[PDB]
Amino acid sequence: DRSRVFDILSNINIGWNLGNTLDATGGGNSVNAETSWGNPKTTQEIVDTVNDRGFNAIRIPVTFANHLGPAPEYTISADWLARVKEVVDYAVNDGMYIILDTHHETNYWLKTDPNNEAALCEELAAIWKQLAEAFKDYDEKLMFEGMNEPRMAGSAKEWSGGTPAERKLINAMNKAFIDAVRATGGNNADRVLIICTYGHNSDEPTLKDLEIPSDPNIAVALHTYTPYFFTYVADGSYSVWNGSKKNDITWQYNNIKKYLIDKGIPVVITETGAQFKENTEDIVRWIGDYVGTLDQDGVKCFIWDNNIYHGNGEKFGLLNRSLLKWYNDDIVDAYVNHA
Numbered sequence: 001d002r003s004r005v006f007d008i009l010s011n012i013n014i015g016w017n018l019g020n021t022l023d024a025t026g027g028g029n030s031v032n033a034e035t036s037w038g039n040p041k042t043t044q045e046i047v048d049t050v051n052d053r054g055f056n057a058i059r060i061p062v063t064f065a066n067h068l069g070p071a072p073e074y075t076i077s078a079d080w081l082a083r084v085k086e087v088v089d090y091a092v093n094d095g096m097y098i099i100l101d102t103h104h105e106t107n108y109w110l111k112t113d114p115n116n117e118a119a120l121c122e123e124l125a126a127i128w129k130q131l132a133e134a135f136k137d138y139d140e141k142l143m144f145e146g147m148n149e150p151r152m153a154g155s156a157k158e159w160s161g162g163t164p165a166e167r168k169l170i171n172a173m174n175k176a177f178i179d180a181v182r183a184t185g186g187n188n189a190d191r192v193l194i195i196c197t198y199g200h201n202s203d204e205p206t207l208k209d210l211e212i213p214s215d216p217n218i219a220v221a222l223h224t225y226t227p228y229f230f231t232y233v234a235d236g237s238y239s240v241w242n243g244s245k246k247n248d249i250t251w252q253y254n255n256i257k258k259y260l261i262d263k264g265i266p267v268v269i270t271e272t273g274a275q276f277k278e279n280t281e282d283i284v285r286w287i288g289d290y291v292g293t294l295d296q297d298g299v300k301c302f303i304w305d306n307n308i309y310h311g312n313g314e315k316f317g318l319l320n321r322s323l324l325k326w327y328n329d330d331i332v333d334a335y336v337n338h339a
């Protein structure tokens with residue numbers, strides 16, 4: 001009976017990621033990492049605005065690597081740990097549902113070499129013991145997501161769910177994450193903990209290999225920017241959404257229903273979105289199809305927002321953070337009013 005997790009999630013309208021922020025990797029071992037990818041320092045106002053528009057859930061991606069002391073303790077620099085807490089507290093201040101993750105650890109130590117399972121597990125666990133100790137007293141609105149797209153960057157199957165050995169490794173790491181949090185007690189005893197597949201991929205072979213913890217307070221996270229060629233810019237990509245590629249969304253979702261939802265396993269899409277390609281009307285329709293699909297079974301999603309819209313780079317930006325104005329109200333409206 002995993003119903004407690006379902007109840008908790010049902011409280012979310014739709015979520016929002018604080019992209020390219022605490023996840024950013026410049027600035028070395030300092031709080032300036034937050035601004036190293038060109039975003040402004042996150043404020044209470046920014047989070048209020050997100051929550052006010054109707055994203056009552058927020059994902060705070062964070063990359064810890066440069067802020068860790070040497071192994072085996074991997075002590076999180078106190079300055080970084082406290083700023084992370086300040087950002088989570090912005091959301092706590094507004095009664096929001098929250099996901100804290102580890103993020104681009106994949107650039108550093110989180111390289112999915114099955115031969116190196118213990119070292120990987122131990123580091124994940126050492127980080128999450130400290131994070132869990134820091135957020136012990138936070139209520140059940142705050143959730144943890146153990147890893148972000150854990151994979152072997154540069155590998156042939158980096159973005160297609162990796163290899164079998166790799167996926168066994170992901171099970172080991174998911175277990176280590178859960179074990180290390182639960183062992184800290186307090187509100188972490190029953191905190192929703194969000195595990196993931198290899199790369200957060202949702203292809204049948206990836207899901208088929210996913211071990212499901214018997215811990216009843218978990219959810220499974222996936223990323224689906226589906227279809228890739230609509231949402232991303234690339235050779236073969238398109239900007240028109242007429243419905244003809246909805247089967248791509250549908251088909252993938254049937255796998256998630258088969259392996260997760262229909263077995264009573266909570267699922268969350270902790271990232272999705274569509275890069276802006278001067279095509280408001282199409283995104284709006286894609287949203288109807290994409291999110292409407294998720295809505296059939298009460299599945300929630302969090303939208304990736306890197307605050308990039310006019311500039312160059314992947315144009316997932318929605319909230320203009322400096323102006324506290326949305327870059328595109330029509331796209332936003334479709335997301336917040338999806339129900």
Ligand SMILES: OC[C@H]1O[C@@H](O)[C@H](O)[C@@H](O)[C@@H]1O[C@@H]1O[C@H](CO)[C@@H](O[C@@H]2O[C@H](CO[C@H]3OC[C@@H](O)[C@H](O)[C@H]3O)[C@@H](O)[C@H](O)[C@H]2O)[C@H](O)[C@H]1O
Nearest residue numbers: 149158159160161198199200201202223224225228229232
């Ligand atoms: O299904 C479309 C598939 O068709 C091929 O013919 C095509 O060439 C191929 O590119 C495409 O698969 C995508 O490949 C991209 C790189 O070529 C991947 O880009 C990455 O997407 C990431 C998101 O990752 C997760 O969600 C989507 C899911 O597809 C993936 O497996 C997950 O791990 C981004 O974070 C990253 O920036 C980007 O490079 C893309 O993910 C593949 O779908």
Ligand SMILES: [Mg+2]
Nearest residue numbers: 186187189190
């Ligand atoms: Mg308790």
